[PDB]
Amino acid sequence: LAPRQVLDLEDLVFTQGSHFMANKRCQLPDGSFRRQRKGYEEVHVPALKPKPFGSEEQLLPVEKLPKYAQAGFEGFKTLNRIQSKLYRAALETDENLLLCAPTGAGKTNVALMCMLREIGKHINMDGTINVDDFKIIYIAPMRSLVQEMVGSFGKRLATYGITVAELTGDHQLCKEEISATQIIVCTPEKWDIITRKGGERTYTQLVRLIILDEIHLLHDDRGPVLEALVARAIRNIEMTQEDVRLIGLSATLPNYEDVATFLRVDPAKGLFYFDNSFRPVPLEQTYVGITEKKAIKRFQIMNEIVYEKIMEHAGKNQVLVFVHSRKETGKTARAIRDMCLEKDTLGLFLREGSASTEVLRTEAEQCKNLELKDLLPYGFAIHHAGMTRVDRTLVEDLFADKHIQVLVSTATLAWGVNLPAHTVIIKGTQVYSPEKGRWTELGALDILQMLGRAGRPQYDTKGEGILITSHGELQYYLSLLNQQLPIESQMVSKLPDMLNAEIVLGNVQNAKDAVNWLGYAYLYIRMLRSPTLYGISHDDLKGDPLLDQRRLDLVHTAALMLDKNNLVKYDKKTGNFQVTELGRIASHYYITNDTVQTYNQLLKPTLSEIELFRVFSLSSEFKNITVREEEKLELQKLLERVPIPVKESIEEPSAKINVLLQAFISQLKLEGFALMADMVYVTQSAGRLMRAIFEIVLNRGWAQLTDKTLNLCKMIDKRMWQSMCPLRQFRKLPEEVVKKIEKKNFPFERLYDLNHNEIGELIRMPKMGKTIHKYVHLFPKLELSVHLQPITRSTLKVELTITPDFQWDEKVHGSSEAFWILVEDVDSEVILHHEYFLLKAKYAQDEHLITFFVPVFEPLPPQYFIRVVSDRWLSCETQLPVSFRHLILPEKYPPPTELLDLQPLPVSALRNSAFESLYQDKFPFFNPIQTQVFNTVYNSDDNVFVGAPTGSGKTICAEFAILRMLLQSSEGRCVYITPMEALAEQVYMDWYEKFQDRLNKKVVLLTGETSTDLKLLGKGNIIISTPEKWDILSRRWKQRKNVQNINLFVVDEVHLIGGENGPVLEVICSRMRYISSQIERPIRIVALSSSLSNAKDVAHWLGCSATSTFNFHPNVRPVPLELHIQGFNISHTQTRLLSMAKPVYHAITKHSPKKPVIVFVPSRKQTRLTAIDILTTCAADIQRQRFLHCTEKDLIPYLEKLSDSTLKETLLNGVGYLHEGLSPMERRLVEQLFSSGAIQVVVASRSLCWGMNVAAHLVIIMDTQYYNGKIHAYVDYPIYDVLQMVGHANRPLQDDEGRCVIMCQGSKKDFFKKFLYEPLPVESHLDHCMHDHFNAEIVTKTIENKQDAVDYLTWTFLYRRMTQNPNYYNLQGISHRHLSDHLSELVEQTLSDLEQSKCISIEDEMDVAPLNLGMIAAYYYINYTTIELFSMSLNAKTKVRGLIEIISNAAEYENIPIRHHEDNLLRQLAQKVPHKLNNPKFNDPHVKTNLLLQAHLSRMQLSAELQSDTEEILSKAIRLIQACVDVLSSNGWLSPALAAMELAQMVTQAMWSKDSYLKQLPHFTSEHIKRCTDKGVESVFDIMEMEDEERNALLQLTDSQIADVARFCNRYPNIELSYEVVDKDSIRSGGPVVVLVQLEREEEVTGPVIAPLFPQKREEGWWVVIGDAKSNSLISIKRLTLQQKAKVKLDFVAPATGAHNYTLYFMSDAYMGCDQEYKFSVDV
């Protein structure tokens, strides 16, 4: 490392561009010769020289090629010689390759071969191809080339079904085709910007083949881009261990060995070198080097030599001249034609009176070009950019028709299409490059391509190429075109910028990372091979043979450059790079560092449009732009009337650039050609630069500058100003009609609501007004209403309802439209919040609900403002004021209850033996909060509330009341409700081990199974349950005597009433108060929570006295709490995480050097990546293994059972990570290692903040945002998650302190502070979630009329908050009539939504009753909208697959998906599973649910996360299928109900209806059931029939396996069924009939249903169904369990005097193959 030295990169740059001539001489081929003619020296090269064949070369017919790739090579048979040499390495090896072949020669066919190899990899059995699985990247140097590449690649590869396309325009939203495309052709810089932005879940992961065409561009000044890409790809391959193939194509140039080293191409296997001999046609070479130094004479001489050469080819095939500009094609064609007219030589091109001249005359009127009709008849033609594509194709067709005898073209033709000519002449090799501010020589690639266009496939025996240029540059153009031009790196010029690109990516984060990165660059290779050219002394090279010191010095210089410009914070000692927002913006908009420093210095919030134009003008991309004399007059004529003022004089090029931009926006044509070129440069570059200024000033919250910059972006794009009538933006509207509209000063606004004829009268052109109307309504516009939700006296939550008020036409609006939402302060200076809003076509009509938080203060600011501005559509702006005239602000938080300095309460205060015993085993004194509250819980019967930080010991407080209840009666029942099940299990373990093990009391954790839970509540003294498990039970409180006999109700984390699941908590808690009032026996209520600012509201809601409610403050936490909030301001999430990487290490070594540390990260991938980052920073800054505290070998036993080698290594170094995908044993082992202190740091996913049982001294929360795959957007951590994560910093019996660092975006800092230092207000969301509760209460008759519904709502927390914060619930007033009217509206709306959903029935618009759909809803605890969709979809239609689809699309499953493109893989196998239908909406929850379900039925092996998904889906599944059975029985037909029962049993045993029943037997392989079916025996109890010796002979199984099988054979239900008809012969048609069925279990075993593949435990169930299959009519259904024996009777109204069968009753709900049927018949 130190000491280093700073280099002058400017001096190290060759400053020759691609014109660097590293060769010192130039040898010529034998036969060549040199002449001198008229002042120009002519060099002649014979070329020719095609070696017939080597040792043994035989061309390969396509028939010998692999079958899969033959069809792509349609229309050809014999590959060229190079192709036949490379067929092996291209289609039979996966090696990276570099092919140096002469230009032309079809070097792209080998790339096609490699592409076909990678295509054949992903071919599946169906004949189709896993198109979604792979992506190939093709890198062409010119967009001209890219378009033809896309076309031809699609044409040749359409047969395999690949969508071949290039990506264009803005990459922000055009990503649908990106997923759709399988081959992506693009320019190197577009790929660079893409990979720069990057991201996770990108398609860059699926990229397996990259093809770098025309790679000799490495010599060009664009070369460093190719270098950056290849270095990036190799480094990322190394990191991913996923090898990616690189295929390089170059010309016959030296230094090819170093280029192969660049591409990791093995010389023997991968390197294939061919010379110019393998050119398709011999290229007779003439090089003309002129010496005349007068410009006028040079022009005349160049025209003279061109004329001489064209006349030497007067009768020859064709002549193709190339010139620099578009007007110069016309000039040169006109010059040669006029020189032909001065002579009589013109007649030599024409074939006398030709039919071809007749064709050129035929298209004289058809060409519709001013130059073309003048020059086409004489055989002349031109090709340039400013030309119709049809006209260009017509010129190409006449040249292919051989009619056009002379063609003059810009290089765009040379790159674009396949247009060969016999003779090709390059008229000059100098061209104006607006970047350089000068005329520079031609890029070697352009020259190589043009002169490769000389000769033709078969029409010519030989081609001839003439190159006219200066005499000095002759040698260079010789050595390039005869293989003596070395290829060198130009990275030194661009090194700082490139480095920033990699720092922003995080790929580089220290100087040594950058030295590695540079090692993968072509610059390093070339420095190692030729140190002389790159300024490295030979003894200097001896000093460090690997060039470590030189690379490190280069990196140090670049880092110092970036730190100067404030892009990157660089630490000299460490060598560390910290990315900043400026550096990211520079990398992400292709801005160089000097430009960004300029922007940072100049840009102030008070800039005007004048100053903003100047700031753009001072961009370092325009540094070489100069004001020349030849143009100053025109520039002065413009600057005299520019709309945006220009302060400086016209001599300063700043003024030139400013004026040129203004002229581009005003759409002006300039006379000077240098002006046209410099405008092209300035404007094409201006887009990204202005977007960069936009993100700067926006993320800086400067409102005015943000507006101006966005509008300037829209103006640069749409080529108009604001004042212009925006209709011109359509591009389908005439210009003159818009002019006539502009003349009228009636605001376009004022023609919105106007009808067509009035519009026409206003324009004065009425007939077309309808069209205007259409294009008036196609103009985007939105409608915004605002719901203000006061959170606190300082914080407001805002719900914006965006409703589209335009018509969506895909021809105009595309797939999506984009808007920016900006909240602005009173004086429109400060952007309080901004947000990007994408209106997609899927919801182009529907409303859009956006909720955000804005601060406020007292006295109230008059208004805020909400502007919505279209990102691309101009003047499409809709602004909404937000007035606080009528804002009702909540009362201030009451002072918290004081924590008195009371004497610590010993355990002896319980005054009971076993109580004292346990709590002396654990401690000698009580927590001070426990101490303060002890008397009220232990020595009173009142309801009590406790509020204190998470980690204060609230559980012991509740245990006190449990103990007092047990003392008052040892048979009493307590119900403990906690909102999270993963916390319920912690409570269950601890409280079983306590109460049950030490007191012979009962502790039962409810399961959700109705009968299991009712038993557990009957037998239990302490019943732990989640809210929903208690809701479903307590609903039937009238029919449940156990629910009424409850004595104590404890509820933990009650603040979670303000969360997503809050409503069910609030509902059960109000249910307990209503029940305690009704039964007159008091049910005591104990509530534990975090500190609540409005704790008194909840206490009153629960009947807690003022003396019983205890609300504390986060300073009273037993363990003292140190909180630090660190703001990171990068808007880009991923880069923000990178910026937070190293400060995690810093916070560890500052706050918790030796004590344990827990880090919380937003996603599972971030767990492992942050662990690796911790270990890397630790290795670099001090020493690793500061985390390990147990000997590595003492942990190797525990370690070797783990699955992830990454996890075992990081654990070895002392850091473990927790994510959903870890198997339970792995998670248990990591948490065990953490509690043991063996591992110091644990990096854990956010989702585990409830599940984790461990704790640490320090808690480091990263980011506080997570990606949603559903919305495809980031969501904030709710405050409750944050509180729990912070509560993890509670180590009581080990640490004196508890420290937590929350790393958040700057904007959130305040909010977090505001709501983490002080108690938290909570409010009810029950007003939204209410329909299912109302329907259930209508079922259980708790609610009978609408007045009873309002009565019901009186008991809620909602009522308490509505009088305290009305605006939060959209109320306006605290009076009693306001409340009654609001409740009236709410009850009417909920009940009418119920009635229309058919769950209830409203009579006289007053009284309500429950229908059967509502009964099936409340019975099975199912959302009513599920029931509605079920009722509408089922009908009499019976499909097992359709049934799975109906169940999946139920509203309950709208959860779980994230990333998981492996569903695609499942989709492939879901193409195999019985149902592949519906369009493949991956990322849709219901799709994932039925996919996982159908995988489960086929006993398919999936991932672990997918298995958890499966578990939850399965539980809610069986309850839904029972609902479906009851629906199909209530009024449906017979076959669908029967199929639903079959689906229930199919789900239980993970069996398909076709599978053999023997698949239910444990330890039974598929070969085993094949053996049994070879016996033909398939009956499930046939195994029971065989003797155990005989069954043992057939099975060949292990005694434990046979024991499991025997338990199942015994548990398998075999029942005796008896059917009977009372009074059978004496029945009546009108009268009812009862059929009696008696069922008796023969075995009479007790236990659950044996289904290991089923998640929860389940009991036997059975169905009985009267109904004929001939008529598909179900008559009489009844379900029942068969414990012991039982009789059942089915009532059914008889038909009319007709014979009928006695049907197919018996059906199961679990075991498959137990289904019976008995038939009979009797008439009336």
Partner 1 sequence: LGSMTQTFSSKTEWRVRAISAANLHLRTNHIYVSSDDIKETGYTYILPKNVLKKFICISDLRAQIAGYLYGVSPPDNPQVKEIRCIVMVPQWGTHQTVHLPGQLPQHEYLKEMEPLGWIHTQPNESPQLSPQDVTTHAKIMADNPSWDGEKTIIITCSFTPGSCTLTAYKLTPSGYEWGRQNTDKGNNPKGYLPSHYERVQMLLSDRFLGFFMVPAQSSWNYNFMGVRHDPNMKYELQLANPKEFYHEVHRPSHFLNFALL
Ligand X SMILES: O=S(=O)(NC(=S)S)c1ccccc1
Annotated binding residues for ATP, written as ranges, equal: 101-108, 948-955
In three-state secondary structure terms, 883 is strand
Smallest separation, CB 710 to partner 1 (Å): 14
Work out the widest C-alpha separation in the chain, in whole angstroms. Answer: 130
Residues 768-797 that bind ligand X (CB under 6 A): 797
Contact 1359, 1353 (CB under 8 A): yes
Nearest distance in Å: CB 4, ligand X: 50
Q: How far is 945 from 942, CA to CA, in rounded Å?
A: 10
User: Amino acid letter at 706?
Assistant: T
- Please provide residue 1318's backbone torsions phi and psi, each rounded to the nearest 5 degrees: -140, 160
Q: How many CA atoms lie within 13 A of 117 on its CB side?
A: 22
**Which residues, other chains included, contact 545 with Cβ-Cβ below 8 Å and sequence gap of 6+?**
none
Pairing of strands 816-824, 863-870: antiparallel
CA–CA separation, 1479 and 1469 (whole Å): 15
**Does residue number 267 form part of the binding site for ligand X (CB under 6 A)?**
no
1278 binds, among partner 1, ligand X, none (CB under 5 to 8 A by kind): ligand X
- Smallest gap from Cβ 1280 to ligand X, in A, equals 7
Q: From residue 1378, give the alpha-carbon distance in Å to each of 64, 820, 1363.
A: 87, 37, 10
Interface with ligand X, residue 713, by CB under 6 A: no
Closer residue to ligand X in complex, CB, 770/1314: 1314
Residue span binding partner 1 (CB under 8 A) among the ranges 878-886, 1373-1381, 1409-1417, 1699-1707: 878-886
From the list ligand X, partner 1, none, partner contacted by residue 611 (C-beta under 5 to 8 A by kind): partner 1
- Which stretch, 565-573, 635-643, 977-985, 1594-1602, contacts partner 1 (CB under 8 A)? 635-643
How many angstroms separate the CA atoms of 962 and 937, rounded?
Answer: 9
The piece of 141-149, 746-754, 1242-1250, 1329-1337 that touches partner 1 (CB under 8 A) is 746-754
Is the CB of 1323 or the CB of 1542 nearer to ligand X? 1323
Helix/strand/coil percent split, the chain, to 5: 45, 15, 40
Q: Residue 1058 binds what, of ligand X, partner 1, none (CB under 5 to 8 Å, by partner type)?
A: ligand X
Tokens of 432: 């104006």
Q: How far is the CB of 1282 from ligand X (least distance, A)?
A: 8
In the list 645, 1103, 1562, 1655, the residue contacting partner 1 (rule: CB under 8 A) is 645
CB of 640 to partner 1, least distance (A): 6
In angstroms, give the least distance from the CB of 615 to partner 1: 13
Lookup: tokens for 404: 């056009």
Contact with partner 1 (CB under 8 A): which of 27, 78, 240, 608? 608
Residue 578 in tokens: 């910290």
Cβ 1278 to ligand X, closest distance in Å? Answer: 4
> What's the sign of the alpha-carbon dihedral 1569, 1575, 1578, 1583?
negative
Q: How far is the CB of 830 from partner 1 (least distance, A)?
A: 12
Q: Residue 583 forms beta bridges with which residues?
A: none
Q: How far is the CB of 647 from partner 1 (least distance, A)?
A: 5
Which of the listed partners (partner 1, ligand X, none) does 722 bind, with a CB threshold of 5 to 8 Å by partner kind?
partner 1
Residue 976 backbone dihedrals phi, psi, to 5 degrees: -105, 120
Stretch that binds partner 1, among 718-726, 1425-1433, 1438-1446, 1541-1549 (CB under 8 A): 718-726
Cα(474)–Cα(997) distance, rounded to whole angstroms?
A: 98
Segment 821 to 840, residues that bind partner 1, using CB under 8 A: 826-828
Rounded-to-integer distance, Cα 1691 and Cα 539, Å = 106
If one asks whether residue 647 binds partner 1 (CB under 8 A), the answer comes out as: yes
Residue 1434 has a CB neighbour count (10 Å cut-off) of 21
Contact present, 351 and 699 (Cβ < 8 Å): no
Residue 420, interface with ligand X (CB under 6 A)? no
Of 1411-1450, binders to partner 1 (CB under 8 A) are: none
Q: What are phi and psi of 1182, to 5 degrees?
A: -140, -90
Binding site partner of 684, from partner 1, ligand X, none, Cβ cut-off 5-8 A by kind: none
Q: Which one, 56 or 735, has the nearer CB to partner 1? A: 735
Q: Does 1060 bind ligand X (CB under 6 A)?
A: yes
Instruction: Please report whether residue 1579 would count as binding partner 1 according to CB under 8 A.
Output: no
By CB under 6 A, name the one of 17, 416, 1058, 1221 that touches ligand X. 1058
Residues 547-606 close enough to bind partner 1 by CB under 8 A: 606
Alpha-carbon span 1321 to 1357, nearest angstrom: 13
Q: Point out which span in 568-576, 609-617, 980-988, 1201-1209 binds partner 1 (CB under 8 A).
A: 609-617
Q: Which residues of 1295-1323 are buried (b: 16+ CB within 10 A; e: fewer)?
A: beebbbbbbbbebbbebbebbbebbbbbb
Residue 1181's nearest CA partner among 559, 394, 518, 576 is 576
Report the alpha-carbon angle 1010-1015-1019, nearest 5: 150
Q: Which of residues 795-814 bind ligand X (CB under 6 A)?
A: 797
What secondary structure letter does DSSP report for 971? T
For CA atoms 747, 749, 752, 754, give the dihedral sign.
Answer: negative
Q: Which does 178 bind (CB under 5 to 8 A by kind): partner 1, ligand X, none?
A: none
Query: Could you tell me the smallest distance in angstroms from the CB atom of residue 627 to partner 1?
Result: 15
Site for partner 1 contains 56 (CB under 8 A)? no
User: Per rule CB under 8 A, is residue 883 in the interface with partner 1?
Assistant: yes
The answer to the question of residue 1373 lying near ligand X (CB under 6 A) is no
CB nearer to ligand X: give 700 or 797.
Answer: 797
User: Does the footprint of partner 1 cover residue 667 (CB under 8 A)?
Assistant: yes
Identify what 1681 binds: partner 1, ligand X, none; CB under 5 to 8 Å per kind: none
Give the list of residues 6+ apart from residue 1704 with CB closer than 8 angstroms, or none: 1538, 1665, 1667, 1669, 1717
The residue within the footprint of ligand X, chosen from 866, 1279, 1495, 1635 (CB under 6 A), is: 1279
Within 10 A of 1483 (CB to CB), how many other CB atoms are there? 15
Stretch that binds partner 1, among 397-405, 740-748, 1152-1160, 1244-1252 (CB under 8 A): 740-748
549 contact, one of ligand X, partner 1, none, CB 5-8 Å limit per kind? none
Task: Kindly state the number of chain residues that form the binding site for ligand X, as judged by CB under 6 A.
Answer: 5
Residue selected from 610, 1350, 1504, 1621 as contacting partner 1 according to rule CB under 8 A: 610
Residue found under tokens 């044996």: 1650
Listed in sequence order, the residues at least 6 apart from 780 whose beta carbon sits closer than 8 Å to its beta carbon are: 806, 813, 817, 870, 873, 876
Give dist(CA 716, CA 679) in Å, integer: 12
Task: For the CB of residue 1306, give the shortest distance to partner 1 in the complex, in Å.
Answer: 24
CB of 462 to partner 1, least distance (A): 55
Contact window for partner 1 (CB under 8 A) among 568-576, 719-727, 919-927, 1304-1312: 719-727
Binding-site positions: 101-108, 948-955
Nearer to partner 1 by Cβ, of 300 and 883: the residue is 883
Work out which of 355, 390, 668, 1179 binds partner 1, going by CB under 8 A: 668
Decide if residue 1039 touches partner 1 (CB under 8 A): no
**Centroid of chain to Cα 1481:** 15
Q: Is 688 exposed, middle or buried (0-12, 13-18, 19+ CB in 10 A)?
A: middle
- 1237 interacts with partner 1 by CB under 8 A: no
N-term to C-term CA, the chain: 105
| Phi, psi for 534 (deg, rounded to 5) | -100, 15
Q: What are the residues binding ligand X (CB under 6 A)? A: 797, 1058, 1060, 1278-1279
- Using CB under 8 A as the criterion, which residues of the chain lie in contact with partner 1 when the complex forms? 606, 608-611, 636, 639-643, 645, 647, 666-668, 721-724, 742, 745, 747, 749-750, 826-828, 859, 861-863, 865, 879, 881, 883, 885
